């Protein structure tokens, strides 16, 4: 039984303004410091969390892009 579940969010997707910055920091340093993260999260008006995430969700792509690296292999069946 839903209990409250109240509250209005701000935004779900990143805005050109937010990206332009986020990327700017990702292009200079993939692993920023607390000071850097705080600044942006405070500038782009976003929660330090979103910042840390975007960085992970974005970088994680390096793998989805047929990362040139031989490791081994594995199967991936489906369920019903």
From Swiss-Prot:
Q: Does the keyword DNA-binding apply?
A: yes
Residues the UniProt record assigns to the DNA-binding region sit at 8-66
GO BP terms, alphabetized: animal organ morphogenesis; anterior/posterior pattern specification; cell differentiation; cell fate commitment; cellular response to leukemia inhibitory factor; central nervous system development; diencephalon morphogenesis; dopaminergic neuron differentiation
Q: Where in the cell is it found?
A: Nucleus
| One GO molecular-function entry | DNA-binding transcription factor activity, RNA polymerase II-specific
Low complexity bias locations: 64-74
Q: Which domain of life is it from?
A: Eukaryota
Q: Report the protein's function.
A: Transcription factor probably involved in the development of the brain and the sense organs. Can bind to the bicoid/BCD target sequence (BTS): 5'-TCTAATCCC-3'.
The UniProt similarity line reads: Belongs to the paired homeobox family. Bicoid subfamily.
Protein name per its UniProtKB record: Homeobox protein OTX2
Tell me the organism. Answer: Mus musculus
Q: What is the lineage of its organism?
A: Eukaryota, Metazoa, Chordata, Craniata, Vertebrata
User: What fragment of the whole protein does this chain represent?
Assistant: 39 to 105 of 289
């Amino acid at each position: 039984g839903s209990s409250g579940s109240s509250g209005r969010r701000e935004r779900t997707t990143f805005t050109r303004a937010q990206l332009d910055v986020l990327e700017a920091l990702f292009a200079k340093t993939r692993y920023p410091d607390i000071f850097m993260r705080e600044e942006v999260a405070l500038k782009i008006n976003l929660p330090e969390s979103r910042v840390q995430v975007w960085f992970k969700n974005r970088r994680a792509k390096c793998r989805q892009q047929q990362q040139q690296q031989q490791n081994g292999g594995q199967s991936g069946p489906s369920s019903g």
